[PDB]
Amino acid sequence: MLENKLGIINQLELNRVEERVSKENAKRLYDSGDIDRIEVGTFKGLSYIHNYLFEDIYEFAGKVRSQNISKGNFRFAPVMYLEIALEHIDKMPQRNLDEIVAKYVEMNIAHPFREGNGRATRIWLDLILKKELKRVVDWNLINKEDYLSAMERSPVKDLEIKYLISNALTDKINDREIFMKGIDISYYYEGYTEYNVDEL
């Protein structure tokens, strides 16, 4: 079981409350205009997003994990060099899709937080795409199974994820609906489907 701020004992109740509360926050991040104020393409901006979503639930929100994490078929950056690997990602270029995908693949391997990495880094990605290409991802054009397979392959070859991203881009960078739908899809990629962000 994981430590939380709401004194929850059940993992299934914790999943439900985390989903509702962080989704409420994600909706606020957008409607408040705070999303537009965040620094783009940096760990400082990523940390801002992660804290915005998870701060009422977890003590660690926005903070770099102090311990090693293992899940999936590739290793995440070991804590022995995670800090300097984040300094390296901050220095990576973001001029074109090749560079944006390569930067994103590295941030996914870093997986700097205890949890919520996927959800926060997808918001973070869309902002880089918004600033540099004047595009966002229509996450509705990316299937869960395709996405998950493409992400697992990415440490070896970023082609599959670059293809899914390239083909889902839209110039509708200020469309609230693309955003809100993307939150619900991002959460679904991680198994959280109890709520709809626009009903919150």
Residue numbers in the entry: 8 to 207
Copy the relevant paper text.
Furthermore, the conserved glutamate implements a Ca2+-controlled metal switch that tunes the balance between these activities without conformational change.
We determined crystal structures of unbound, phosphate-bound, AMP-bound, and ATPγS-bound wild-type EfFIC (EfFICWT) and of unbound and sulfate-bound EfFIC carrying a mutation of the catalytic histidine into an alanine (EfFICH111A). Notably, the C-terminal α-helix that bears the inhibitory glutamate (E190) shows no tendency for structural flexibility, even in molecules where it is free of crystalline contacts. EfFIC forms equivalent dimers in all crystal forms, but the arrangement of these dimers in higher-order assemblies varies between crystals. Depending on the crystal forms, EfFIC does not form assemblies larger than the dimers or forms tetramers related to the NmFIC tetramer or forms hexamers comprised of trimers of dimers, making it difficult to establish the functional oligomeric state based on the crystallographic assemblies.
